[PDB]
């Protein structure tokens, strides 16, 4: 919330770059990005985090279907919907 | 790493048309240490002064211009109940599993949240009950009639009660409306005290079980809000002059203790610990952290500010909530073991029913057996092992 | 060392702490400290 | 380099004969508890080689023919699962089958009991890891419950149980520990457990079987925690139904017990006492599943009533899965009815009203059986106070009257006086500081009795007694949580002298913290010179001396 | 008229058959204990008739052929002696011979045990009245001793004991109670008791018999208290000779277990390390009266040495008839020798100088055998402290050295750490307030280990381990009885963190009352804001609020 | 009530030729409450001031200008020992089982009455050690060189310590011979104190673990002897001008505390609580009862005076011992459970031997068993009896 916008999208892009360089894992990157995606007030931050999540899923399932990763993310989205029906946070899982 | 959390509430319309701050959110739950953040939000609430209560299961929020208390489940994080109390609400506190409500007509309401039983005292206060403090044996109700009444909980709440409830004592040395009440954590007959702040620019330290006035303090401004430090050494008061003062019980000139002067002698406090700017506003609510080194003040311009007594004379703004902050209550960083959990609440109802208690029984390990030692002991116990060997042979 | 204060022992119990940033040596509400971030108030630990 | 403890373990298991391995079990257990690092490492070094050999030898002993080897295997498995963590947990899948085979085989019952404890420890430790419950606990637990119910089931109507009641107690304790964690798996066995442990809830003298106390609380806990296995979230409904059925059984038994005495008690809940047959011995119970085993005789009725009151105590001693509706009004009405019938003093038999037709021998049996019933009622009150804490303040006023009436009726009973002291301490720590003058006056004989017990134990009218210990624990409460203004001066002087002669540091601290005020206002002298001279180097006494004197 | 309890007792004894009397025994004993009045009166009213009939029933049941009636008579005699006084003491003359007849008859062993307990209590109560002693105890004691000794007498080498070791333990406990009060009567039997209880003083793993700890303790206590029966006031001489022989046996066993290592310990009392052959396993003991049964093997020698250390502990746990000269110099020399053998750390096998003619198996069995011996030494030091108090202040410095050395040797052993915490609490409560900076510095690692254990239990690094309990009982002592001017600020900070995060109210109060000065001389801020917020209405803060009492 | 007893000692020849008391008798053991009677007499001794010590088993009495401590067996009624010391005794006390003796040569000795050890210190003083006091941890020795030394008890009692013993501190602000010493009940470093009394017309209150001089009191006459009250509120002091004064430490003007003055400021006491005639003479020894209400003084003419501190009445003469009463010691009416009883003592011997401790071991229930509960419990325990039943069947 409190960082500058350019610095915070640089941090997100650098985390995605470290995932590309295989320093960190896809599960670690997604568990970092997703609560910030659902709880961030910044529209640009939410848009870029959503774009990076979609790009990470595409790059993971491009060479072969990663059933474990898909199952974990689907379970996470299902829990997000199941936790609070009246909340509007499920639209991110819907868009994904 | 212990995490210190506090709960904030707002009242009234938003001060500025800012789309960043959500309009419908009433109650915020934050973190104070190590970094400020907003954990959770509760919507559709406008809480006046002294109408917020919090416990590990629920948040109780009395409503401005309504005779409603909103009950919020923290475990489920949502609106659980809309409790409609029969007559208007001015203040409320929570002491265990009972909500004590001071009303605007002078009545006192005791609502057991687990059994759904409501006890209504007769209107011994001829105007509105402004402040209510509670200890597990006493209830102190200070009202706008310049009167403070002391009640016994065991006398207020019992089974098969038909007699009208009468206060044990009345403390009426003030000359104006009682703004605030605080009570020392002690419960002994002679070591306890209570500090009462009224609109006659005075705070009186009383011994409420004996009904004796221990000390009288005069401030340039009448105290809007007032809180004792955790170790019962000092009082922090805000004033209408936007200034915050501190009074020490046991200093070089002690207010209480053997070295203190006569009770009839009145001490004047004129040295300001801190002050807030005119555009900030006087501190509407005050709260003290667990260690007691830090204070949080809520001001009707919407900002929550932190005071560090040792380090910073000037307070530091944490955030601006765009609406008048009326209550700040701290949550203890340690978890407390309680044999019952109040998962669901029971609404107040007037009907002929048997006295029923509704709570989930927590596992407190009250039952112990000899096999429990073998179960929780690493390896086998020596005596049980040799007994097993002998009975095998 | 500072000379003897006749009313310091009881004022340490019955008065608020006057030390700037009290309870910093506890670090109850902060992150755990490694060797570099540990505090060394006395010259014995500093010299060591 | 494997540890010396590990290589001693492997060498001793290789060399020692299997029959004398049980004698070396205490040494091997301590050595395995020392072997922390080798067992916790993830799956070639000599450490890993000899860990593999040690586990292979454990499996060989467990699947071997020798009962001594099976006993040693059970002990070593318990030590390994207590030490090795998650690797030893996941390498225990054949060990669970072997432990079930120990129970199924005709092994000695000490080996069976150790297998039961080891399996309970396994099923408790597996709860931390979600996958391990999926792979190990849930496939093998119905087999474990089937083996336990096969051991515990009565083989025939004429044939008694082959196992002792201590083994019954061990099985009940294990199933009580497991129904909380694996309720849906233990659901189909609820019918057989409830039928098997039915006689042990409230055993009477007519059963001709001596049931141990530990088996009694374990049976009570199992039949209360069997409400966890209710389908479609019916745990709260079954709990409330069972506790109200127990209160009804208490009332129906109390009719047959109290048929000699005419009662003036009325029910706020609405229970009406049905008429009882004047002829014959009192009787109750049935062969039906919902009823308890039948009893005959007034002593049997009193034992049944005491067992039912202890079952109600176990209700407050056991946890619940979901919020439940506790019938506090019904329990208070039951305790009021059972405390209004008091034993006489010497010569009050003609004073209190009695049935004319009933026998005088049965009457004497009744008022000999009354103090046990009052003891059970006071214990139930203590459990209610402990579980509810500040929510028993509404209930607090009637408990004082019940305690005073019970203690004044039977002040010759040391057990009744003791439980009165614990109950008094509890209710005074909850609501004692604002008791009215009438309550302070009626609690005065309890104060005198407690001080007399303390002085008799101290010799200033013996040794340590439970009654003396309870009264000594109660003694500081008379200063801390009782109004000193309502106390007469002789009671305060007796309390101060009792504290001084008993050398009770907490009592002297409380007495100095709470000075006595008479009617005029004259300050009674403090006992601080006694306290400082008796306990000079105590830190609380030092602060009290440095502060009260100023 | 008659009391209802006595009426029910007589009616149950009349109606109930003898076979079902033991399962109605808890009824009868409770009612008899309630009926304290008429039995205590000297010995026509209904009370006197029922008491005479009741005593007649007791006599008939004890003379009856039914073992159930005999068991009921034993329990009823015990109750009558307990709540009957001097009239029952005089009327219990045939009851003594009846109880001895119960012991002699082939009756169940629970009945024999209860008869033994009843006889022991009867003699204990008879000791008060001197005429009753000469009337009853003097003729009957040789018969009771003869019966007990023929019960616990070993039949042959090939023939094992017919009675279990717990029954032997009960016999040993009864004789331990009786030898103190009656010395001259038990003087002829002193020879047979030593031969009977020789194999249970320090049992080893080479005897192929598992001996209970209660039997071991009672045999040790009885062989120590047999010096009461020494003729011509030779009690002190026999006590000194026995303890010196035990110390010599410890030294000779220590040679055999320590043949593997080169010892740098030089005796300050006169003992010299005799050479031990380096071929074959260590062995010791013999078949003579003055020495313990033989053992062969290093683990057996370690068990023998540990049992002898526990026998030395029982010397201070038992009283003495006359003043005795305790060989404290020999005890400290022995404990120094046993604690100077430190097992090596990981990867430090060359650290300790050792005999190169003895193999790894003996070496690494010794490195596992040391911690139990060190634990026994620490318990012996605890017993010496608990017996002497201020007379052990001369022994304060080197016992701290041994404790620190053992704790640093066995930091990974929870039992050793727990015993070190207990001994540290005792020594610091004794003479810990004047320790120098060097002693504080060498006690620092134990402080860190205790704080780590408490924080591990509290979850700020679950159930409470005994190590955690012993460290939490030691945490306030680190403030109250330790020089805070010699303590590093990091240690004080760790102690305050441990107290606050573990909710130790005594430790928080001790921190508030023993503030830590910095180098500037200013006091550290007090914990008290945490103590009041955790325990607001406790006696700990109620004492600190004494400045408001007026 | 409770039976208080006290012991008196006599030095010098009998003053009057004809008296009812026997001339040889040197020690009396009396009763103060409820009535005065002479329990026992001990035959031959001449005890100077501060040369008497009473335990529950023995009475130790130093002789006048001889190096002889007469030891009397209080549990046998006779004299047990004529123990000779290397130097003459100026003062002696008893702590635990150690007789602490200050000699005429500036030497401090500790005699372990149960082992026979005689630890000697180097002559750190340069005149005779006038007064001695002890804690469980420290030994205070004040002498005629206006010097008071603090010694560590563990350092003094270390077995193989061959280095020369040295005092930790030297409380030296006095300018004349130290007459008396008293020690506060507490042993903590921050809250204990010790009071001196010297011939420089003064008494100094010290913190004997930090060396700080906490308070200075000037009397009109030089103190001879003193005693603290049981509650450590007052210091009753006898002076040379035949008067008893009360130094109230924590009263209207506190000597120590938050309301106290500067330590450099000296407090002068001039109000006598009691006065004795020149016929009676000034009090040679003072002692205060268990309750603290009663105070006993010894006078060189043989009078024993009782002073009521609470009632403030006239002194009452109890008995006349016909010669100077140099010592008065009260025995506590309650008994402390001690597992070792010193039936006999060991005379000091300097020879090479093992450390041997000689005492009788008392029954203290240091062991526990399941059968002890069965014996001590009235009847049988229910679980044990039920186990006996199922073992029978």
Short mmCIF file of C-alpha atoms in Angstrom, two decimals, chain E residues 131-305:
data_model
loop_
_atom_site.label_atom_id
_atom_site.label_comp_id
_atom_site.label_asym_id
_atom_site.label_seq_id
_atom_site.Cartn_x
_atom_site.Cartn_y
_atom_site.Cartn_z
CA UNK E 131 0.84 -50.97 79.36
CA UNK E 132 -0.80 -52.09 76.11
CA UNK E 133 2.69 -52.61 74.65
CA UNK E 134 3.67 -55.18 77.28
CA UNK E 135 0.21 -56.75 77.16
CA UNK E 136 0.00 -57.19 73.38
CA UNK E 137 3.01 -56.25 71.25
CA UNK E 138 5.72 -58.11 73.16
CA UNK E 139 4.30 -61.69 72.88
CA UNK E 140 2.83 -61.35 69.39
CA UNK E 141 5.70 -59.65 67.54
CA UNK E 142 7.96 -62.78 67.26
CA UNK E 143 5.06 -64.67 65.65
CA UNK E 144 4.29 -61.89 63.17
CA UNK E 145 7.98 -61.50 62.31
CA UNK E 146 8.34 -65.27 61.89
CA UNK E 147 5.32 -65.38 59.57
CA UNK E 148 6.62 -62.47 57.48
CA UNK E 149 10.11 -63.98 57.26
CA UNK E 150 8.85 -67.42 56.22
CA UNK E 151 6.72 -65.69 53.58
CA UNK E 152 9.66 -63.72 52.14
CA UNK E 153 12.33 -66.38 52.74
CA UNK E 154 14.05 -67.60 49.55
CA UNK E 155 13.33 -71.35 49.35
CA UNK E 156 16.31 -72.45 47.22
CA UNK E 157 18.49 -71.36 44.31
CA UNK E 158 16.46 -73.38 41.82
CA UNK E 159 13.11 -72.67 43.47
CA UNK E 160 11.86 -69.10 42.95
CA UNK E 161 9.74 -67.14 45.39
CA UNK E 162 6.12 -68.23 45.68
CA UNK E 163 5.08 -64.69 46.69
CA UNK E 164 5.42 -61.70 44.34
CA UNK E 165 7.88 -58.91 44.88
CA UNK E 166 5.16 -56.36 45.68
CA UNK E 167 4.10 -58.57 48.60
CA UNK E 168 7.76 -58.75 49.62
CA UNK E 169 7.76 -54.94 49.38
CA UNK E 170 4.75 -54.73 51.71
CA UNK E 171 6.50 -57.03 54.21
CA UNK E 172 9.64 -54.88 54.03
CA UNK E 173 7.61 -51.70 54.56
CA UNK E 174 5.86 -53.15 57.62
CA UNK E 175 9.17 -54.30 59.12
CA UNK E 176 10.64 -50.86 58.36
CA UNK E 177 7.82 -49.31 60.38
CA UNK E 178 8.25 -51.79 63.23
CA UNK E 179 12.04 -51.93 63.73
CA UNK E 180 12.16 -48.27 64.81
CA UNK E 181 9.61 -48.65 67.61
CA UNK E 182 10.59 -52.20 68.65
CA UNK E 183 14.35 -52.74 68.50
CA UNK E 184 15.04 -55.46 71.07
CA UNK E 185 12.24 -57.69 69.78
CA UNK E 186 13.42 -57.38 66.16
CA UNK E 187 17.06 -57.88 67.18
CA UNK E 188 16.99 -61.73 66.77
CA UNK E 189 15.37 -61.32 63.35
CA UNK E 190 17.97 -58.84 62.05
CA UNK E 191 20.15 -61.61 60.60
CA UNK E 192 17.43 -63.22 58.50
CA UNK E 193 16.16 -59.89 57.12
CA UNK E 194 19.59 -59.02 55.68
CA UNK E 195 19.86 -62.37 53.88
CA UNK E 196 16.25 -62.07 52.68
CA UNK E 197 16.59 -58.54 51.27
CA UNK E 198 20.20 -58.73 50.02
CA UNK E 199 19.27 -59.24 46.30
CA UNK E 200 17.06 -56.10 46.17
CA UNK E 201 19.50 -53.37 47.26
CA UNK E 202 21.29 -52.95 43.91
CA UNK E 203 19.74 -55.39 41.42
CA UNK E 204 21.49 -55.81 38.08
CA UNK E 205 20.52 -57.06 34.63
CA UNK E 206 22.50 -60.27 35.22
CA UNK E 207 20.07 -61.58 37.86
CA UNK E 208 17.26 -62.19 35.30
CA UNK E 209 14.67 -60.88 37.80
CA UNK E 210 12.87 -57.54 37.52
CA UNK E 211 12.72 -55.94 40.97
CA UNK E 212 10.26 -53.07 41.63
CA UNK E 213 11.47 -49.64 42.69
CA UNK E 214 9.21 -49.70 45.76
CA UNK E 215 10.76 -53.01 46.87
CA UNK E 216 14.24 -51.58 46.28
CA UNK E 217 13.50 -48.45 48.33
CA UNK E 218 11.85 -50.36 51.18
CA UNK E 219 14.68 -52.92 51.34
CA UNK E 220 17.23 -50.08 51.46
CA UNK E 221 15.24 -48.30 54.18
CA UNK E 222 14.91 -51.47 56.25
CA UNK E 223 18.59 -52.38 56.00
CA UNK E 224 19.44 -48.83 57.09
CA UNK E 225 16.92 -48.80 59.96
CA UNK E 226 18.04 -52.24 61.17
CA UNK E 227 20.85 -50.40 62.99
CA UNK E 228 18.16 -49.41 65.52
CA UNK E 229 18.27 -53.02 66.77
CA UNK E 230 22.04 -52.98 67.33
CA UNK E 231 22.91 -54.06 70.89
CA UNK E 232 24.77 -51.93 73.44
CA UNK E 233 23.99 -48.67 71.57
CA UNK E 234 25.93 -49.71 68.48
CA UNK E 235 23.48 -47.96 66.16
CA UNK E 236 25.85 -45.13 65.20
CA UNK E 237 28.82 -47.48 64.80
CA UNK E 238 26.86 -49.82 62.53
CA UNK E 239 25.51 -46.84 60.55
CA UNK E 240 29.02 -45.47 59.94
CA UNK E 241 30.39 -48.93 59.11
CA UNK E 242 27.53 -49.61 56.68
CA UNK E 243 27.84 -46.27 54.88
CA UNK E 244 31.63 -46.66 54.65
CA UNK E 245 31.20 -50.17 53.24
CA UNK E 246 28.72 -48.77 50.71
CA UNK E 247 31.21 -46.07 49.66
CA UNK E 248 33.94 -48.72 49.32
CA UNK E 249 31.59 -50.87 47.21
CA UNK E 250 30.90 -47.84 45.00
CA UNK E 251 34.65 -47.31 44.54
CA UNK E 252 35.32 -50.99 43.74
CA UNK E 253 32.45 -51.06 41.24
CA UNK E 254 33.73 -47.79 39.77
CA UNK E 255 37.11 -49.42 39.13
CA UNK E 256 35.49 -52.25 37.16
CA UNK E 257 33.24 -49.95 35.14
CA UNK E 258 36.07 -47.43 34.59
CA UNK E 259 38.80 -49.87 33.49
CA UNK E 260 38.32 -48.46 29.97
CA UNK E 261 39.39 -44.89 30.78
CA UNK E 262 42.50 -43.38 32.32
CA UNK E 263 41.43 -41.44 35.41
CA UNK E 264 43.21 -38.24 36.44
CA UNK E 265 41.30 -38.23 39.74
CA UNK E 266 43.55 -38.49 42.81
CA UNK E 267 41.86 -39.28 46.11
CA UNK E 268 42.00 -36.82 49.00
CA UNK E 269 40.88 -39.52 51.47
CA UNK E 270 43.18 -42.51 50.90
CA UNK E 271 41.65 -44.72 48.22
CA UNK E 272 43.94 -46.01 45.47
CA UNK E 273 42.89 -47.28 42.04
CA UNK E 274 43.79 -50.97 42.04
CA UNK E 275 44.69 -52.45 38.63
CA UNK E 276 41.92 -54.26 36.76
CA UNK E 277 42.55 -56.87 34.06
CA UNK E 278 41.95 -55.61 30.52
CA UNK E 279 40.81 -59.01 29.18
CA UNK E 280 37.14 -59.99 29.16
CA UNK E 281 34.03 -58.21 30.34
CA UNK E 282 34.03 -56.43 33.72
CA UNK E 283 32.62 -58.38 36.65
CA UNK E 284 32.12 -57.99 40.37
CA UNK E 285 30.15 -58.98 43.43
CA UNK E 286 30.04 -62.34 45.12
CA UNK E 287 28.08 -64.81 47.21
CA UNK E 288 29.27 -63.73 50.67
CA UNK E 289 27.06 -61.87 53.13
CA UNK E 290 29.05 -58.61 53.20
CA UNK E 291 28.85 -58.09 49.41
CA UNK E 292 26.03 -57.84 46.87
CA UNK E 293 25.08 -60.65 44.43
CA UNK E 294 27.50 -61.04 41.50
CA UNK E 295 27.28 -59.17 38.22
CA UNK E 296 29.07 -59.61 34.91
CA UNK E 297 28.95 -56.95 32.23
CA UNK E 298 29.52 -53.21 31.95
CA UNK E 299 25.80 -52.36 31.95
CA UNK E 300 25.32 -54.60 34.99
CA UNK E 301 28.15 -52.76 36.73
CA UNK E 302 26.58 -49.41 35.86
CA UNK E 303 23.26 -50.61 37.30
CA UNK E 304 25.06 -51.85 40.43
CA UNK E 305 26.79 -48.48 40.89
#
